Amino acid sequence: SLDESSGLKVREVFINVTRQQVEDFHGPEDYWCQCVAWSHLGTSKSRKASVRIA
Amino acid sequence: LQVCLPKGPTCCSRKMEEKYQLTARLNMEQLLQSASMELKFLIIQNAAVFQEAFEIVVRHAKNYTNAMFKNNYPSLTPQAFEFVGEFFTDVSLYILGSDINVDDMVNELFDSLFPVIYTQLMNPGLDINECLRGARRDLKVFGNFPKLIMTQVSKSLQVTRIFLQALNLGIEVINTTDHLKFSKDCGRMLTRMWYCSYCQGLMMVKPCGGYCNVVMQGCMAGVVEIDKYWREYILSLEELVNDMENVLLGLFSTIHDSIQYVQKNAGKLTTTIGKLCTLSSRRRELIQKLKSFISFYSALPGYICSHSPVAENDTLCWNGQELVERYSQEPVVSQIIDKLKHINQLLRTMS
Amino acid sequence: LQVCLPKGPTCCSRKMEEKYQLTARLNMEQLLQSASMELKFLIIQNAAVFQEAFEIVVRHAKNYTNAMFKNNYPSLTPQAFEFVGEFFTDVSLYILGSDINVDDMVNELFDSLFPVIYTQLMNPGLDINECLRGARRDLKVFGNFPKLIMTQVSKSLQVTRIFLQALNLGIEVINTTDHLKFSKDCGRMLTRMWYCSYCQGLMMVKPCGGYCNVVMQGCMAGVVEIDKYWREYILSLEELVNDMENVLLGLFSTIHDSIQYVQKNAGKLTTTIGKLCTLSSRRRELIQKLKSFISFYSALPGYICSHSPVAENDTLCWNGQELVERYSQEPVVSQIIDKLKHINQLLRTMS
Amino acid sequence: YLRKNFEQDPQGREVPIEGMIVLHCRPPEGVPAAEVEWLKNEEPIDSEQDENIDTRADHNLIIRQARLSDSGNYTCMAANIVAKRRSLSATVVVYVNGGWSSWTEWSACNVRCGRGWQKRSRTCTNPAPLNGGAFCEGMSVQKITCTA
Ligand SMILES: *[C@@H]1O[C@H](CO)[C@@H](O[C@@H]2O[C@H](CO)[C@@H](O[C@@H]3O[C@H](CO)[C@@H](O)[C@H](O[C@H]4O[C@H](CO)[C@@H](O)[C@H](O)[C@@H]4O)[C@@H]3O)[C@H](O)[C@H]2NC(C)=O)[C@H](O)[C@H]1NC(C)=O
Ligand SMILES: *[C@@H]1O[C@H](CO)[C@@H](O)[C@H](O)[C@H]1NC(C)=O
Ligand SMILES: *[C@@H]1O[C@H](CO)[C@@H](O)[C@H](O)[C@H]1NC(C)=O
Ligand SMILES: *[C@@H]1O[C@H](CO)[C@@H](O)[C@H](O)[C@H]1NC(C)=O
Ligand SMILES: *[C@@H]1O[C@H](CO)[C@@H](O)[C@H](O)[C@H]1NC(C)=O
Ligand SMILES: *[C@@H]1O[C@H](CO)[C@@H](O)[C@H](O)[C@H]1NC(C)=O
Ligand SMILES: *[C@H]1O[C@H](CO)[C@@H](O)[C@H](O)[C@@H]1O
Ligand SMILES: *[C@H]1O[C@H](CO)[C@@H](O)[C@H](O)[C@@H]1O
């Protein structure tokens, strides 16, 4: 994508993940996911979103 | 001084005496730990293994039933996935000691299963769902499959739950063994037997074997009383072992046969409803290695005296207050006893 | 001063002011007592009368049943005397608000009656008595007489007990009325209205009627709110009045018919058991005299102002701080409201 | 005269192994004063037999520790010259809560080179659940990736 406010490369990534993935995950913590973005200067991590079975 | 009986001069004060008492405590705890370590590791290993094995069996049965629903009744998915997951989650929970009613598990399972069968297999074409849930029980549409499943799974899950609780309680009592605190007089006698010889200026004098025997019989008075209850616990566990996996695996076959039994009367059912609305090897090996420890509480004072520096010859030894040429001669325990009595009554009433 | 607003000089100090406050309290309590005395005595009289009348009815029914047993079943005496006395004692107890179960009364009555019938009427010829007591209930020997008697007496005894409770609660609220303590500002206003004129040197000056009206509306703010609930209480009592004596009198006829019903099946019963082992005028007069007090809480401030020295003429009167030629212009209460709501709901759900 | 209905029936309670519980009993109204007697599972209990149990003048059964006097159907019974009356039996069940064990040692990495595994066990044995006690809350095993 390209932003209107400023002409710079924007990137949007989507990840699905099924119920079978969470119910079959037997880790110690809640099924969490993090987002890492790569730049010419370095990297940046986002919030850890934990997908859980209600 | 208050522990080492001062026959004459002495090289130690009261503070060095308290130091010797603390070292005696540490040495006794270490000896009990060394005595109990092998049995403790055996029971901890088996407890972990059987818990993991049962969880694996539950998961395997769960998605085997899921696969059978997906292959034979695709019209009942994904609702079948949801209530099968709920049922097997409750099964695993009941296995792990939670307050769960097995009959209620089966009843909720069939009450969730019947409406989707009616709407997707018999009458293809929602808010009257609770009425259908009622019709599941009021017309007894599944016949005797629910009671059969109730008994089959209740028997096995109850014996499995009691087995896991028994393993954990054995771990608990064997772990309390090496942490047993004794009386003040027993501590002073252990200090006199092990270290008070140093206060008199002796370097390599060891306590008398008979003196160690009398000291340990005075100390382990209540501890030996646990032997009868421990033997009865081992025997009751052996009675209980002589299965949870077979029932949970045949669950899907039984459910498929129940669905076919229900479908065999659809002609009148739709009209009247529209009108109204190596595991066995592991248990055997554990029992065989555990029977070798039935004399754990009876041989413990002998172990403590034989695994400590003693003058077995009873010649030139420390009797507790002087160098002689020849020796002349409950609450925590009650807690262990009560827990053993409970688990033994449970194992007795099961088989 | 802190109560009498000193317009100029004054004849009283702070101590004389506290004295006037205490006399104002005593005068207000006496006025409320004089207002409430008639209604309180009426309800106390009627409560006592109805309690005595009910006790008379219970005793009459008691020895009516006693006479019928003595005349028709002399072989069942004196055991009949004993269990009839027990039953009617329990009846009197339940009437007076005790925690008594009517069904248990009837069941104990028939459990005491059946064994003596078996031993003195059916099988002429003791320690197996409880077995016979059991056979009373297991074979349902008295048919539907127990349920008939249970319903018949439960209805009448419950309405009678609720009637007595309603009378007692009316007594309680009317007696609490004259003990009501008011706020500090209300007390200071009463002191200003009744006695602060004396502090200024006046001898016979009376407070203004409108000033009394505003002072009493400020004081009796929460007390007037009791009027709706008190009126509904009176109306619900009138609804409840529009019987316990008829049931307790027909009890002997029903018991005799039950005994005949039991004797009609003796042929098989003996074999299987030997093998196995003005009042309405008084309520109406009370209601008619009570309806005259339906405006008790609404006319109470009017009573307080009309029965106290007031200048009804509104000319040359005391307004609270000076002599004028023309006047210019909860917790305990909540307790009374809650009890009235409860008794009103009971009276509504009864009839 | 002795009444059938008890003034106050004993209440069933759930008490931990160390907890203390008092069973209240108010016998029915009667002349003379009813003699209250406690029966554990339809069998009388002797107050002098154990320090843990004692009978109070106001008819109360006090248990300090749930160890010396375990679960049962305690029933209060009033005795009089007239007759005897049984109260509603209280189901006293002693429940043991689950308690975590310490972290064991980390296991050796199964794989010699690359991604390995290290395990740490945590059993539910200090104390182990009894008489249907709540099981330990949380995870029992700990696994970490190791690089050798
Ligand atoms: C076998 O016996 C030994 C000896 O008794 C025993 O070792 C002990 O383990 C317990 C674990 O509970 C230790 O107690 C802990 O101490 C730490 C530090 O003070 C606390 O943070 C812990 O508190 C947790 O649990 C509390 C329970 O009330 C909570 O209130 C708290 O919030 C925490 O969740 C806990 O009290 C104890 O110190 C050691 N003993 C020694 C001498 O090290 C062992 O657990 C037993 N079991 C097995 C199978 O090993
Ligand atoms: C269940 O197991 C089958 C193989 O038997 C597999 O194909 C499927 O992915 C599994 N499904 C789930 C929910 O784990
Ligand atoms: C003492 O030593 C001798 C060495 O031969 C041995 O025969 C004897 O059994 C020992 N005494 C005891 C009490 O074991
Ligand atoms: C009531 O009791 C008396 C006891 O003196 C008895 O004589 C009488 O017959 C009984 N009642 C009636 C109304 O007959
Ligand atoms: C009212 O006041 C006048 C004098 O001001 C007097 O004549 C009359 O009698 C009074 N009447 C009443 C009823 O107060
Ligand atoms: C306890 O008593 C009740 C009746 O009061 C009964 O239902 C229950 O089964 C009894 N429980 C035990 C464990 O005896
Ligand atoms: C074990 O779990 C936690 C520690 O994480 C505590 O709530 C408590 O010590 C429990 O037994
Ligand atoms: C194991 O984990 C940590 C120590 O690393 C503590 O929270 C606690 O001792 C637990 O048993």
Author numbering:
A (entry chain G): 100 to 153
B (entry chain B), C (entry chain A): 62 to 186, 192 to 308, 315 to 349, 383 to 434, 456 to 477
D (entry chain E): 154 to 301
What does the paper say about this structure?
Guidance receptors of the Uncoordinated-5 family (Unc5A–D) have emerged as key players in navigating cells and axons (Hong et al., 1999; Leung-Hagesteijn et al., 1992), where they trigger cell-cell repulsion in response to extracellular ligands such as fibronectin leucine-rich repeat transmembrane proteins (FLRT1-3) (Seiradake et al., 2014; Yamagishi et al., 2011) and netrins (Hong et al., 1999). All glypicans share a similar architecture: a structured N-terminal extracellular core domain, followed by a C-terminal linker region of ∼80 amino acids (Kim et al., 2011).
To produce complex crystals, we mixed hGPC3core, mGPC3core or murine GPC3 residues 31–488 (mGPC3488) with Rattus norvegicus Unc5D residues 32–307 (rUnc5DIgIgTSP). Strikingly, all three datasets revealed an octameric assembly. The center of the octamer is formed by four Unc5D molecules that are aligned in a “head-to-tail” antiparallel bundle. Two GPC3 molecules wrap around each end of the Unc5 tetramer. Interface 1 is located at the C lobe of GPC3 and interfaces with the Ig1 and Ig2 domains of Unc5D, burying a surface of ∼690 Å2 (mGPC3 complex) or ∼640 Å2 (hGPC3 complex). Charge complementarity of the interface is provided by hGPC3 (R120, E143, E147, D151, D160, D165) and rUnc5D (R118, E122, D123, R156, K157). The electron density maps calculated for the GPC3-Unc5D complexes revealed extra density extending from hGPC3 N241, one of the predicted N-linked glycosylation sites, toward the center of the complex. This glycan packs closely against C-mannosylated tryptophans 253 and 256 of rUnc5D TSP1.
